Amino acid sequence: VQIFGDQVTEERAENARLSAFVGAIAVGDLVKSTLGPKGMDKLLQSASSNTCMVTNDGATILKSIPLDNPAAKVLVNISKVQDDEVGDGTTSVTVLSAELLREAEKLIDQSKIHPQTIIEGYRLASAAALDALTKAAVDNSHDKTMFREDLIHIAKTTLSSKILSQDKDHFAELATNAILRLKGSTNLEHIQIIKILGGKLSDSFLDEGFILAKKFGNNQPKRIENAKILIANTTLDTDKVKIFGTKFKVDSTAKLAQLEKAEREKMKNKIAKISKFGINTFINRQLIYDYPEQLFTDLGINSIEHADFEGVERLALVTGGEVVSTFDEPSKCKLGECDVIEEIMLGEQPFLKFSGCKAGEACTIVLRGATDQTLDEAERSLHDALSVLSQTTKETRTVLGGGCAEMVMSKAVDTEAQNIDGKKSLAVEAFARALRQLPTILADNAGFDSSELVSKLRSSIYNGISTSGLDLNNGTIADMRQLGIVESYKLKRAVVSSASEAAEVLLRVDNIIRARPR
Amino acid sequence: KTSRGEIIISNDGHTILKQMAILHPVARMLVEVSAAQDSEAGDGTTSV
Amino acid sequence: EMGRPFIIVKDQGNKKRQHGLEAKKSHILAARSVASIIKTSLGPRGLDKILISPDGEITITNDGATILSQMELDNEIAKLLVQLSKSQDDEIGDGTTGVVVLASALLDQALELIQKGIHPIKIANGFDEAAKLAISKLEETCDDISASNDELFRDFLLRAAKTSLGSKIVSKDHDRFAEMAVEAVINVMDKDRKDVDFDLIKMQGRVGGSISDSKLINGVILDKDFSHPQMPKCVLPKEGSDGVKLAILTCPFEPPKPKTKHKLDISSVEEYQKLQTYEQDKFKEMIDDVKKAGADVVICQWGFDDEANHLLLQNDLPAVRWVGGQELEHIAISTNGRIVPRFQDLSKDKLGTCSRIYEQEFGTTKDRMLIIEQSKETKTVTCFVRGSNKMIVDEAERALHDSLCVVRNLVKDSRVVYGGGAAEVTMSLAVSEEADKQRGIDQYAFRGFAQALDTIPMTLAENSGLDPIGTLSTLKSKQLKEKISNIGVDCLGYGSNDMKELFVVDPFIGKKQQILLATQLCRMILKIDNVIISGK
Amino acid sequence: ISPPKPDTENNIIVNDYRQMDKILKEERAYLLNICKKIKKAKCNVLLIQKSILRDAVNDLALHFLSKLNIMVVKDIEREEIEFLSKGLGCKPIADIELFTEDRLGSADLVEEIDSDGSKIVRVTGIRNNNARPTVSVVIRGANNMIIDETERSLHDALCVIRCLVKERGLIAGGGAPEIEISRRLSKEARSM
Amino acid sequence: ETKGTVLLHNAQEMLDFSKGEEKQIDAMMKEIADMGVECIVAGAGVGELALHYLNRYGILVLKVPSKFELRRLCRVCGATPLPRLGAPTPEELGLVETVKTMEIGGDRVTVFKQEQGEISRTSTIILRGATQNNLDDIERAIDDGVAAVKGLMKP
Amino acid sequence: ILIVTSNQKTTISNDGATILKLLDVVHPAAKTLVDISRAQDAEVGDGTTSVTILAGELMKEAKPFLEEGISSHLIMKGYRKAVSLAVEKINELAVDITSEKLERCARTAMSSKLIHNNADFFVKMCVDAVLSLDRNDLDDKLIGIKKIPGGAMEESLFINGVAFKKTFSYAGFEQQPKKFNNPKILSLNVELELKAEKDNAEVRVEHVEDYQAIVDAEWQLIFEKLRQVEETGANIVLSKLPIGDLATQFFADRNIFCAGRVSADDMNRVIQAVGGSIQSTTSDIKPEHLGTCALFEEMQIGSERYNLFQGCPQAKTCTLLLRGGAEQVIAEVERSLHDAIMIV
Ligand SMILES: Nc1ncnc2c1ncn2[C@@H]1O[C@H](COP(=O)(O)OP(=O)(O)O)[C@@H](O)[C@H]1O
Ligand SMILES: Nc1ncnc2c1ncn2[C@@H]1O[C@H](COP(=O)(O)OP(=O)(O)O)[C@@H](O)[C@H]1O
Ligand SMILES: Nc1ncnc2c1ncn2[C@@H]1O[C@H](COP(=O)(O)OP(=O)(O)O)[C@@H](O)[C@H]1O
Ligand SMILES: [Mg+2]
Ligand SMILES: [Mg+2]
Ligand SMILES: [Mg+2]
């Protein structure tokens, strides 16, 4: 008795677990090459308008590619949350969560372990895993110079995976200065990344100011000094009063000539109130029409038009002033200050350069690269780099990487497996062996041995040296403190918790129900 | 000969690569390099 | 036929019929097809299932109602089971899976009795007498908990809270979700411990973070930022004050205009300048009204323009826009404030009171979500649930909703029973005992219901991987040896089939509802003889 | 330059029959007195931009401007207003209250010749206080496809001059530095 | 009939315009109610404000949204309609003793049975049956019988 | 009999009118049965099937006589002459019973369907449904009962009043109390919200000083409309038309419950339950026309809120909430009661 309708695919047998497990293996193997510093970039061919996209992050790749498997959606969704939460470590969650299901496959088939036992071991194994990071962390909050050095090494670790592995020595100073500029503001929207194609990749810079994408309107000068900035959000152009039911009962056109004159008088009166501040620059988000633009010429005030609302927030914080409207009361209102303003040209589009501002609560980064795809990759990289360093301020604790983070978890996880005697020990050992594969694929991408190199890292830590790790440029074990690579505590806490809970999803599934497409 | 009714003669490699609709994405990257060579230098768009 | 087209009903050739014994076999096998889906899901050792909607969205669920709700079916017999699980989900919110397998258990045992030639009404009347007899026995054996004090009554909720969370994901952090679920009801409850309002506590999930980051906060969740974010994000109260003096308004900041369409005619330049004066004085009078009222944070329903941003920023007055009317219903009850319609009726007695207002990021760029917290007990609790996946936090919503519903059943007085398969077996042996002297023609009818109740313990035996016959033999022999009827099948293997000791409790009103909806549907399905179905 | 119609909503009402003669007199007078004030500043050529929501110059206004010997040109693009003010040194005029003699430019001859069915309006001679003068070069040819390539061929020519004034120095082309750099790196390649 | 739209220049008219419609509709019902009428047959849709003052004094309302349905009822009581909303003339007022509402076919029906005194015309026949098809043929049999009664008048 | 029409609407029933209603019968002679059934249901509401089977056997018994040389009028003369004696014979079979003062007649009308086995509980309260109705009125709309998907049929109870769904969530609904000791019901018809007054919207204003006053006048009259409702002490407010957020929040402050989005058939049942009247104007409100009852309590019923009235000294209304598992269970309990209520 077929209770379901026509064209209803249902799998209530071993093929359901096989179809769900092979889907994660396909998603897992897709991202094995993108992990590590020697990883290869991937290429995406869009189906609409031939809009290509080059990206190394697994979140952008898996969201762009179509996948009809329900298991693929979990790997897509866990990567989207990791991309939005931290902004780094998405491929580690995808490859680790798939490897946990890969390691859990042989327990179901060969050893015939219950699914409730595998997850029960992962609960106790994940608990001991996070406890290893509790003692393995180090707080560098007592000294700002050491914390300044920590943001360097975290930038070295995050930027090495992208195409900027050579130029990370220069952008590490650029990345950490933007974080010290923001002085704790973890909002990534306060950094404008201006995209410019052409020039050498190392020609990027970080000017102490805010760079506009637009220019002056008609005749206002390029070079000035000692300018007072005033920002406004209201219309300031052909003022349509708040009630639209207004009308003019005109008995003669001569009186209507006075009414349009009265609209110019109040606008002339409004610009007269702007001059009471004694300013030299005025900025408004709405596009400025011709009539109020002309009155700024006699007053000696500059005018900038059509600024975006997200840029007004960046513009207010770099200038250090305040957005002013309802200009009758100039006493309570506040305005910013700047030393020099000058219009520049980087390529074809001109830009406005600000330098010497008082407040430095925000900045803008100008990238320079050969193509729009390399420039885009650069943006995706800096965004991932600045996202990790931004959360490092609120979460000062850090963890050493390079295979040492995954192994010190396995050292504590393997110790706890003996005190839980029974059939659960195989599940906890499967969680341990899943963690050994992260330094394995990191060695496979560089073209080194998978067994002997991991075996040397195994013996080095149990001897009583909790600072050993993999070094990929030479292919041998080296000290992590001397090389200077380290990750944040929130990152390693996130990928272990995300990959652990991701394994809990597709292990509690036995039946797959597919309704009709719409 | 473009898709619409416009016709254009072109010796410039940037405008040749711009009007040519390429199916392969890696070959399409050369269109952006010629755009980058045209924006930065403005000479030798085919030599790059 | 006699050659002419012999047609009666419209669309004669499309629809079909089915009668006799073959109509019954289509019904029972259709229930077994649905029962096999639910049988491998029930119990603490169950397994989730993925329901792919037509729009591509998926839901990882192990509750019978959400599975059957998002299932595209054709057979009408399963569509009645779709509504039976939905019936258990709406009112009680516990036992959806149980009803589906229990109704199938009555249907599976009824198949053997139809082969013997018993009329279906005698079958249906037998379960009706057996169901009321089992309810009458179970009402006597269960004990009351109202005699205990409030300290022990909290523990009984923890017994049922851990029972409802388990069998669901959210079974790790389940010790804290039990305390969090009980702590939600301690704040929102009546002094007489009766008829608590469930609508005061709404569900709210957030895609991000981990399960450990979830915590309790007494307030409202708004998915928006403050207006013109130049002010500090976390506003604090004054040094000496009763509170932040929350203000809510269902009027946008604008000049007063008629609701009807109007035509304000300005026939002179002098009147045009008075319109400019009238435009500015209204905004000046507006900010002076809220200034004299002492409000710090203002909540506006219908938004406002950009002119009020600077007036609100200079006076240190945060504000928001586009707050829906449903949220204002939640804000007034939480902060104990009265929503004023306009500024002329503005008074200090109508303003609310709360501890502090602040906002955090939760990550990079997602969205700024507002948070409110109270300094004491209030009539509103908003669960702040986090999750690593959208399906995790979506399942955690309906899982915690069922947890609050199970505690809601215990708010009713003297309704407690120890589950774990004990309630099924203790109601089963008495029905077989009554049949020995109430033989009649319905002797096999009681035996069918006695064997149908025992299937849920056998379902737990299959999921746990134990021998069913040895389990039911030990439970049946133990119930006959001793009249203590709180021993059941323990799947988590903590030793001891005893169960008050394990701490497994289910609500008494939920357990009797299992056999009622199962018997009430079985009485309906057995009445069907002709099955007319039309083509789509 | 048009009859009065503000951006704010309006509605003209005529109550008496004799008011129709008055408003018709005041409409042309509103155009006449504004054109009368142009004669006071002795401005001889006017350039209007692209008008939105209404006609740029009313046909009734052209009679006043044509009899007083004033050239009228409309439908100029908005981005070119910066070009004309920078080249001619004439500040724009958005209102007659700010319309003065000091803001206007100067020119010796604005001639519109007739040749090959294509009109050209060229200004001969510029003199002003301007440190940023302008330049304009027309293109002629057989068809538009050659006009487009003659424009882009000049862009590649000007970009070479832009590069030399940007970065000082130059090198001899013709394949010289490719062989020279290949020889130089080939010398060092055997050492590394 | 031509563009009925409100016009309120000041707040004094806004306050009295809401109460003016109530007092105006009430004042028209006073002249109608003082004549001792207790049921009014309407020809089209009746407003709610007019209905509030009709059922105050217990005046029944009847819908007859058609021309012939309204004309047949005047022949029973012998009333002369007037489209004005003023006072009905006493000579034109009809005479009906009782208006009952009972269940015959399960739906609501209104009856206008007269008595032996003050007889009326255009009577009806309540025809009860099981099959709607039989009602149609029996109804046309009454039309044939009524048509046979016409044969006595002319010759 | 289980039937599913083209629109995929499931239905289960044992009735002659309902089964033939859903089946679109195109045969002309077969629609006479639809008509007989409908007719008996209408005039009686019970025994529809019997009528159809009897009709069937008389026509099936007339089949061999039509095969013979018997004319059509001879067969009809026999039944029409025999049915006259059957009606007179049934008058002799029937009794003139007056002693013993409903209970037994309801048990037989519930047969052949769901609630026959539960007749011990449903007949006790079903007899009380018609006793509330007085003689010579017998209003069927007062016995209007609604659908509640969810619950078990055993947990139903008898109600001395009405229970209607709100069908809308107001902004100030939770602020009002759910429990009044001595509530007072007042039925309204005016629309309590800020909008156009009487089917039009056109307001000319010349001076800007009066533009502030005309807006305040609209705010003045709307509270004047609400204050007249407040001064009489009406705790429960009901209106067919919608009620805006401005009015329900004004009532929410001083403990005054309100509701809207209800039909006219539901409103007519509210008046006869409380014994009040309809007032479509706030100025003509008096204290005497307000209805009263014993108590008020809004209870959770199937994830749907219902405003309960009960305990009136003299109630014309009986309205019970039908809770069940499937949508056909609540439907079968409705049709079974609707057939039994007509008999008693
Ligand atoms: N120069 C290096 N020496 C040693 N280890 C390195 C070096 N560069 C990168 N790594 C290791 O490679 C890993 C790169 O991870 P990454 O690609 O950033 O993950 P995701 O892309 O998922 O965020 C880091 O964990 C780091 O320890
Ligand atoms: N008169 C000439 N004689 C010999 N070689 C030349 C002459 N002019 C240019 N070349 C060579 O030919 C090349 C022409 O490049 P060109 O076509 O200008 O590139 P693009 O068109 O992309 O700017 C130059 O690199 C130069 O070495
Ligand atoms: N931790 C536990 N220990 C023992 N029995 C349990 C436990 N959790 C649930 N059960 C039992 O499992 C049975 C099925 O519950 P379940 O199907 O998970 O709830 P629902 O039917 O509401 O989804 C119940 O009868 C209950 O007694
Ligand atoms: Mg990375
Ligand atoms: Mg449960
Ligand atoms: Mg019957």
Cα four-point dihedral sign C91, C93, C97, C102: negative
Cα–Cα distance between F316 and F271 in angstroms, integer?
A: 9
Which tokens go with D71?
Answer: 């050239």
- Phi, psi of C157, rounded to the nearest 5 degrees: -70, -35
H or E stretch including F168?
A: none
Instruction: Determine whether the interchain pair E9/F220 forms a contact, defined as Cβ–Cβ distance below 8 Å.
Output: no
User: Within this chain, do residues C96 and C60 fall inside the same structural domain, yes or no?
Assistant: yes
Domains: count for chain D = 1
CB A122 within 8 A of CB A431: yes
Ligand 5 midpoint to CA C61 (Å)? 12
User: Counting ligands in written order, which one lies closest to the CA of residue A86?
Assistant: 1
Residues C188 and F323: their CA atoms lie apart, in Å, by: 28
Q: How many residues does chain C have?
A: 536
Range of the domain at D101: 1-165
Whether F contacts D, i.e. 3 or more CB pairs less than 8 A apart, is no
Distance CA F229, CA F29 (A): 60
CA–CA distances in Å: residue A61 to residues A80, A385, F316: 10, 18, 70
Tell if the CB–CB gap between B42 and D160 is shorter than 8 Å: yes
Spacing of C-alpha C193 from chain mean position:
21
CATH of the domain at D94: 3.50.7.10
D174 lines ligand 2 (CB under 6 A): yes
Number of Cβ atoms within 10 Å of the Cβ of C67: 26
Inside any domain, residue D187: no
Four-residue CA torsion sign, A181, A186, A192, A193: positive
Alpha-carbon torsion (A501, A505, A506, A508), positive or negative: positive
* C contact residues 336-375, partner F, Cβ 8 Å cutoff: 338-339, 341-342, 344, 350
Nearest protein CA to atom 8 of ligand 1, as residue = A37
- Of E44, E39, E154, nearest to E100 by C-alpha is E39
| Interchain contact F39–E (C-beta under 8 A) | yes
Ligand nearest the Cα atom of residue A446: 1
* Closest Cα in chain B, distance from residue A370 (Å): 6
| Residue of C25, C388, C392 best to disrupt the A interface, most CBs of A under 10 A | C388
Task: Identify any residues that bridge with B36 across adjacent strands, giving them in sequence order.
Answer: none
The closest of F340, F302, F342 to F107, measured between CA atoms, is: F340
C322 and C209, same structural domain? no
Residue A90 among the catalytic residues: yes
Q: Contacts of residue D60 in chain A, CB cutoff 8 Å?
A: none
CA dist., res. C524 & res. A323, Å (int): 71
User: What is the residue range of C439's domain?
Assistant: 1-145+415-536
CB of C108 shorter than 6 A to ligand 3 = no
Catalytic residue among A34, A55, A57, A414: A57
The token duo for F220 is 């003045």
DSSP string, A436-458: THHHHHHHHHTT--SSHHHHHHH
Q: How far apart are CA A307 and CA A315, in angstroms?
A: 9
Beta strand ranges found along A307-400 (DSSP E): 338-345, 350-355, 363-369, 398-399
Quickly tell me which residue has 């609100």 as its tokens: C312
The sign of the torsion formed by the CA atoms of C460, C462, C465, C468 equals positive
Mutate to test the interface with B, among D143, D144, D149, D170 (most CBs of B within 10 A): D149
Q: How many CA atoms lie within 13 A of C33 on its CB side?
A: 19
Of the candidates A193, A153, A158, the one whose C-alpha atom is nearest the C-alpha of residue A173 is A153
Q: Name A201's Cβ contacts closer than 8 Å, sequence gap at least 6.
A: A164, A167, A368, A369, A370, A374, A378
**SS3 state at C50:** strand
Q: Which of D149, D154, D155, D156 for a ligand 2 pocket mutation test, highest count of atoms within 8 Å of Cβ?
A: D156
**Measured distance CA(A97)–CA(A117) in Å, rounded:** 17
Neighbours of A305 (CB within 10 A): 17
C139 & C226 share domain: no
CB-based contacts of C159, cutoff 8 Å, min separation 6: C503, C504, C505
CB pair distance less than 8 Å for B26 and A43: yes
A155: nearest Cα among A146, A164, A143: A164
Atom number in ligand 2 closest to CA B12: 21
Instruction: Name the residue with the closest Cα to ligand 2, atom 10.
Output: D174
**C-alpha–C-alpha distance, residues D180 and E72, integer Å:** 117
| Cα atoms in the 13 Å half-sphere on the side-chain side of F66 | 9
Query: Nearest CB to C255: which of A242, A325, A512?
Result: A242
What is the pairing mode between strands F257-259 and F236-239? parallel
The contacts of residue E102 (CB under 8 Å, 6+ apart) are E109, E111, F136
H or E segment to which residue F111 belongs: none
Which residue of the set C63, C89, C108, C442 is catalytic?
Answer: C63
- List subunits contacting chain D, requiring 3 or more Cβ pairs under 8 Å: A, B
Atom of ligand 1 nearest to the CA of A495: 22
Closest chain B residue to D164 measured between Cα atoms? B41
Q: Is residue D77 part of a domain?
A: yes
- Interacting residues of E110 by C-beta distance below 8 A, sequence separation 6+: E62, E99, E100, E101
C window 478-497, beta carbon within 8 A of A: none
CA C99 and chain centroid, separation: 17
Examine the residue annotation and report whether A414 is marked as an active-site residue of this protein: no
The pocket of ion ligand 4, defined by CB under 5 A, consists of A 88, 161
Q: Are residues C313 and C449 in the same domain?
A: no
**How are beta strands F2-4 and F10-12 bridged, if at all?**
antiparallel
> How many residues in total does chain A contain?
518
Q: What is the dihedral of CA B16, B18, B19, B22, to 10 degrees?
A: 100
The partner residue sitting opposite D146, judged by closest CB among B9, B12, B43, is B9
F313: helix, strand or coil: coil
End-to-end alpha carbon distance in chain D: 77
Q: Are strands F322-324 and A249-250 parallel, antiparallel or unpaired?
A: unpaired
**Resolution of the deposited coordinates, in angstroms?**
3.2
Residue tagged active-site, from C96, C163, C335, C353: C96
Torsion, CA F235, CA F241, CA F245, CA F247, rounded to 10: -40
Distance, CA of C70 to chain centre: 16
Beta carbon of A158 within 6 Å of any ligand 1 atom: yes
For ligand 1, atom 4: residue with the closest CA: A471
Angle at A132 between CA A127 and CA A133, to 5 degrees: 105
Cα D26–chain centre separation: 33
**φ, ψ of residue E136 in degrees (nearest 5):** -70, -45
Q: How far is B9 from chain A (nearest CA, A)?
A: 24
User: From the CB of residue C126, how many other CB atoms can be counted at a distance below 10 Å?
Assistant: 27
Q: Are F236 and E40 in contact (CB under 8 A)?
A: no
Q: Which of C65, C73, C33, C31 is nearest to C49 (CA)?
A: C65
Residue C370 β-bridge partners: C222, C359
| Cα gap D76→D47, rounded to integer Å | 8
- Name which of C4, C24, C76 to mutate to probe chain F: the one with the most chain F Cβ atoms within 10 A of its Cβ: C76
Q: Which of C521, C109, C31 is nearest to F12 (CA)?
A: C521
How does strand F184-188 pair with strand F203-205? Answer: unpaired
Q: Which domains does chain E have, with CATH numbers?
A: 1-154 (3.50.7.10)
Looking at the structure, do residues C223 and C336 belong to the same domain, yes or no?
Answer: yes
Say which DSSP state A237 is in: S
Name residue F11's beta-bridge partners. Answer: F3
* Of D97, F97, F214, C257, nearest in space to E15 by CA: F214
Rounded to an integer, what distance in angstroms lies between the CA atom of residue F19 and that of residue A131? 69
Method: cryo-EM
Closest ligand 1 atom number to CA of residue A156? 8
Neighbour count for residue A192 (Cβ, 10 Å): 20
Give the residues across from C359 on adjacent strands: C370
Question: C63 an active-site residue?
Answer: yes
Q: What share of chain F is helix, strand, coil (3-state, %, to 5)?
A: 45, 15, 40
Instruction: Establish whether A57 is a catalytic residue.
Output: yes
Backbone φ and ψ of C384, nearest 5°: -105, 85
Homologous superfamily in CATH for domain F163-344: GroEL (3.50.7.10)
F326 and C83 Cβ atoms separated by less than 8 Å: yes
Mutation to test the A interface, candidates C97, C310, C316, C393, most A Cβ within 10 Å: C310
Domains in chain C: how many in total? Answer: 3
**φ/ψ of residue C356, rounded to 5:** -160, 160
d(CA F16, CA F30): 13
Are the beta carbons of B33 and A372 separated by less than 8 Å?
A: no
Contact assessment for residue C99 and residue C84, using Cβ atoms and an 8 Å cutoff: yes
Q: Are strands D120-124 and D109-113 parallel, antiparallel or unpaired?
A: antiparallel
Nearest CA in chain A to C77: A3
Burial class (CB in 10 A: 0-12, 13-18, 19+), A9: exposed
Q: Which two tokens stand for residue A500?
A: 């652990």
What is the residue whose two structure tokens read 């609904």? F173
Specify whether C139 is located in the same domain as C52: yes
Residue A513 tokens, joined: 């129900």
Taking the alpha carbons at both ends of chain A, their separation in whole angstroms is 25
Instruction: Please give the full DSSP string across chain E, using - where no structure is assigned.
Output: ---------SHHHHHHHHHHHHHHHHHHHHHHHTTT--EEEESS---HHHHHHHTTTT-EEEE--SHHHHHHHHHHHT----SSSSPPPTTT--------EEESSSSEEE-----SSS--SS-------S-HHHHHHHHHHHHHHHHHHHTTT--
Cα→Cα distances E131→E135, E143, F62, F76, Å = 7, 19, 19, 16
Looking at the CA of C93, name the nearest ligand: 3
User: Strand, coil or helix: what is C182?
Assistant: helix
Whether E62 contacts E40, CB under 8 Å: yes
Question: What residue in A sits closest to B28 (Cα-Cα)?
Answer: A52
Contact (CB, 8 A) for A339 and A357: yes
Q: Is the CB of D179 under 6 A from ligand 2?
A: no
Q: What is the DSSP string of A21-44?
A: HHHHHHHHHHTSTTSSTTPPPEEE
Q: Tokens for A303?
A: 């005018």
**Cα(D127)–Cα(D135) distance, integer angstroms:** 14
Please give the Cα distance from A380 to A382 (Å, whole number).
6
State whether the beta carbon of C451 lies less than 6 angstroms from ligand 3.
Answer: no
In E, which residues are within 8 Å of F136 by CB distance?
102
C419 and C508 co-located in one domain: yes
How does DSSP classify residue A108?
Answer: I
Q: Which of C296, C402, C454, C490 is catalytic?
A: C402
Question: Residue C372: helix, strand or coil by DSSP?
Answer: strand
Q: Around Cβ F131, how many Cβ atoms within 10 Å?
A: 10
